[PDB]
Design a binder for this molecule. Sequence first.
Ligand SMILES: O=c1[nH]c2cc(C(F)(F)F)c(N3CCOCC3)cc2n(CP(=O)(O)O)c1=O
Ligand SMILES: O=c1[nH]c2cc(C(F)(F)F)c(N3CCOCC3)cc2n(CP(=O)(O)O)c1=O
Ligand SMILES: CCCCCCCCCCCCCC
Lengths: 52, 104, 196, 403
Amino acid sequence: RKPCDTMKVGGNLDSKGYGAATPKGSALRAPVNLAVLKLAEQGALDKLKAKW
Amino acid sequence: TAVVTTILEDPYVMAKKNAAAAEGNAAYEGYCVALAAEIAKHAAYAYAAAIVADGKYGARDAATKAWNGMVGELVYGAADAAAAPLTITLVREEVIDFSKPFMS
Amino acid sequence: LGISIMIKKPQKSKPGVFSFLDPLAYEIWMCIVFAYIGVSVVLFLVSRFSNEFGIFNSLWFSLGAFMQQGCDISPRSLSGRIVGGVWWFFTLIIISSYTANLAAFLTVERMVSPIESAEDLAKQTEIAYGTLAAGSTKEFFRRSKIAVAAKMWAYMASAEPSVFAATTAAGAARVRKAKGKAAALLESTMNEYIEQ
Amino acid sequence: VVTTILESPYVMMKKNHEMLEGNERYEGYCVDLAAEIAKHCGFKYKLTIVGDGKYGARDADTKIWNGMVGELVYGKADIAIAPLTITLVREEVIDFSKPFMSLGISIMIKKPQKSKPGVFSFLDPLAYEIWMCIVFAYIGVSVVLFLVSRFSNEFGIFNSLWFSLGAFMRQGCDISPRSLSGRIVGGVWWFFTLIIISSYTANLAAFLTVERMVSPIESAEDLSKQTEIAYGTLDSGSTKEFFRRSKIAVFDKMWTYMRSAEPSVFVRTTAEGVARVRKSKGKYAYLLESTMNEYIEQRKPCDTMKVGGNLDSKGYGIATPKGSSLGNAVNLAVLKLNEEGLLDKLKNKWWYDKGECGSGGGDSKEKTSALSLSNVAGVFYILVGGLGLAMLVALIEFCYKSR
Ligand SMILES: O=c1[nH]c2cc(C(F)(F)F)c(N3CCOCC3)cc2n(CP(=O)(O)O)c1=O
Ligand SMILES: O=c1[nH]c2cc(C(F)(F)F)c(N3CCOCC3)cc2n(CP(=O)(O)O)c1=O
Ligand SMILES: CCCCCCCCCCCCCC
């Protein structure tokens, strides 16, 4: 999404990850973990990445 | 209700054109706003998206153990979810409880 | 002294007497002769239905046409000019091909780099290298904590044949018989005694 | 009471496992991972292989887990230090670590080797457009030379075509133009033919000297577009059921293709799939887990390779039953191991250092060979065809003259 003067070559060196964090010991931990896992299973996270 | 904390300016959360015309969370939408709409329908809550004020992700300052920005807004109980790209790190993990990655 | 490489001495590698014709296989060099006889007879046939294109004269023209030289005579009828044109195209392709492949031979042979250091031998995998069975050189590699040294040890630990040699006399023999396949790793002073 | 699995790169039995078997004997990536977790979390674990030999799955009527889920939900074992594709139904029954390794559905194709050189290969050093332009330039120069010599010398059309063809093939010209305008054409065509022949020879030398091999297929989108190469999965599994429950544009095509195609692209086992990819030269592409692909391409005979990115991302965890006091003692250990650069060091060593072949050595592997008759025979065919045609037109002219 920028004028193609640059490009990405080669696989990434290390690994990381993003998570919809919740405060320690809260009641929205398990349902949010389930929501993220179920979203990723159905590709609603791959349909969104391919969009933006 | 619950209060969400999103960082800005990225590919993730952006401010819409005619942001002043719109109001509430609808004034700014993006990838991680579309995501934080789907998680609602699986955890069944109505929120109001609230951008972090400081504009930093978070780290305990060396002098004072004060967590800044988006993780700080969680630790101190100011707001609940963190629907934004928080890298899963050990130091953040020992304080805050994450989810499984939604992107690698 | 130190741990030093040991490889088979590269021979002079004298070129063959008739090495100028390597860039084309033997089958090509003989089908050229056979196609030349065929063309020289067909050109005679076509010219002679009922001038200067007898059989000897036709063999001379076709020889000249192959060697890019060309003669004083030239076919002057449609069905001799077809043979001339096709033999011309064939010889153009063959001569261009010979020169191109000869250049490929010379260029590739020029960029040859022998295994000169330990790093080069570590990266390259075509040559197997083996220390003595039990000694300070093998224990060095086992206790070695250098990535390049560990890379060799990881290789030397497992191999389809036993890269290790039981005796240093055996180790010298294995390199000589392997013709560059075996690269012993012995102490510098013994290496300089053996090569001398 | 940690479990494990029999997968070769992850938990393997040493040589002569009968002589030495047990905790101090077993080898594998998961084994060393467990050891490092112990170094970070000292505990009394005895390594026990999974009884069933497979990973969890609940039968619909039976409603029981088995393998690494059955051994953990039913308190039969402590944890499971092994590759679990962390997922919804397994997370609803176990407590999963943060993924200690991420992966995807890679694409596996046979390593491209040089093909048998087909006939009509002698005209490779120049593009097709250049050959067509050469033909029509020759036919344009000859007709212009004819017109010029017949404004103001024989140089009829039949003789001008012979002169131009003679000048192109470097063979000496029979006659030469005498006028000025007839000489400009000759000079220009001489220059043109000199440049073209030099270009052909030079580019052919480049072709023979250094060779470049290109993968026929790059990514899965182009693999769907091509459809000339047949690509198959394993019969039944995550890597198979994914394509059925997929709604992305490309993936639905890649499924509805293999859904209805003959013969059976779907392979009974991964060993048979890799054997089929190795057998068929280029017609088969295999879609497996990224890790298994990366491991396979390192083993002998190193005849395969992995092309393209990962199609959909999954993770391997370290399972732990819900009520365990060890449940939170593994998240932090995994995150610290990941951050220290130790897990990557482990995977690097056990996958590349234990590598049957290395890319950094012999990559050029420069070797030149005498040009066989196969490369050239495309011109021997043309030669004999031209001779046959010449005899044919000779008899046609003879029979025409006789009457
Ligand atoms: O949790 C984190 N989330 C991050 C998210 C982003 C992004 F979303 F891409 F903006 C980035 N960028 C990538 C590099 O260019 C600048 C922005 C870094 C992040 N970092 C590391 P830091 O912010 O550079 O210390 C984190 O630790
Ligand atoms: O949790 C699971 N983890 C798995 C891990 C692996 C591997 F990592 F490779 F060991 C594999 N293989 C894929 C091909 O190579 C050999 C076996 C299958 C797994 N399956 C079965 P799936 O559902 O068909 O993926 C699981 O269920
Ligand atoms: C002197 C005239 C020679 C004519 C040779 C014609 C060559 C034809 C080859 C066509 C092959 C095309 C393959 C795609």
